[PDB]
Design a protein around this ligand. Sequence first.
Ligand SMILES: *[C@@H]1O[C@H](CO)[C@@H](O)[C@H](O)[C@H]1NC(C)=O
Ligand SMILES: Nc1ncnc2[nH]cnc12
Length: 261
Amino acid sequence: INTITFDAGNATINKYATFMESLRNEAKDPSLKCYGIPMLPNTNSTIKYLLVKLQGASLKTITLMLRRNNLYVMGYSDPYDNKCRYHIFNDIKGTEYSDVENTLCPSSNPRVAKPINYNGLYPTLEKKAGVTSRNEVQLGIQILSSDIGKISGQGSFTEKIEAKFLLVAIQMVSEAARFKYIENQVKTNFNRDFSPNDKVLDLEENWGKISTAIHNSKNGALPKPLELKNADGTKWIVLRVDEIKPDVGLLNYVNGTCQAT
Ligand SMILES: *[C@@H]1O[C@H](CO)[C@@H](O)[C@H](O)[C@H]1NC(C)=O
Ligand SMILES: Nc1ncnc2[nH]cnc12
């Protein structure tokens, strides 16, 4: 399928909202769904990967590659020195590595590797970015755009601006597609840089747990209380699907049948 493109350089709320629904519809399994929330396919889908190309105000682009099963960013490419430069995490190896390498930069055209010499987990990217927690890294449409410019087409760049770019892009593409609440935090703060609040980090952290709970609900009631966090960090106890459903855009794959609507 189509590369999903988003222009951060000339963005509006409505263009970002279109981007998110295009991403959720290409990513979802067409028939899996629980309580009306679409689910991701499992690892034997016909299409296993999705490509997302981001463009900044400088008009330079970066293309992210995502595993469709769980929306994980595996690596990215940029136009560099008349070549396709592919950047892959140090733990993507074998079959995956070269479906990534060869889908980001076709073997029939000039290309070059520039490894990401660390993995894609949040503790690793926070360490590389120089912060204690990723709430110290600001998100926003201008920051994503300036960050594309600092990497795309550049010979040299630091591991600190690369890992800040990836914390920003993972949350504004993958976490925003998974959670309607994070998509709504970006649209609210559309014209300013903002820091992710406590409910944003708590949802990011409990995606798998939320999906399993919704899938296992009987007549709209969660198997057991789900303890999450409000925007100010206070405890939030969730007992029913309709309480949490406003914040969720996609379920992580969970095997078996569930109430579809
Ligand atoms: C997945 O669910 C199906 C349908 O209930 C079941 O037959 C199968 O054993 C499950 N697979 C695993 C690994 O649990
Ligand atoms: N590489 C990544 N892609 C998507 N979501 C993530 N959350 C943690 N790391 C991530």
